Amino acid sequence: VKAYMFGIVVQNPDTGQPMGDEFYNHILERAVGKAERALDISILPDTQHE
């Protein structure tokens, strides 16, 4: 994600503190779910009991 934003950095203006990868991973986990519903698909490997 940072590579796609090369030359751009996000910082809290009241600090010299950027955001951690925890937020990015949280976004990515929700993001992959979003594509997981845009298509009626399960993407990550998982066992199923149907």
Added chain:
Amino acid sequence: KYENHTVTLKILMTLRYVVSDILKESRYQYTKFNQPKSKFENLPQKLLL
């Protein structure tokens, strides 16, 4: 050969200045945005040369 003569020249010299007075000496700003804390910075002076 030029023992008793008047010599005249045209010449190029490098430019030089000295400071006679300082005009609009100090200008200031409390820069705080996107900083850990407030900071003081000196903005450009103007010089009369």
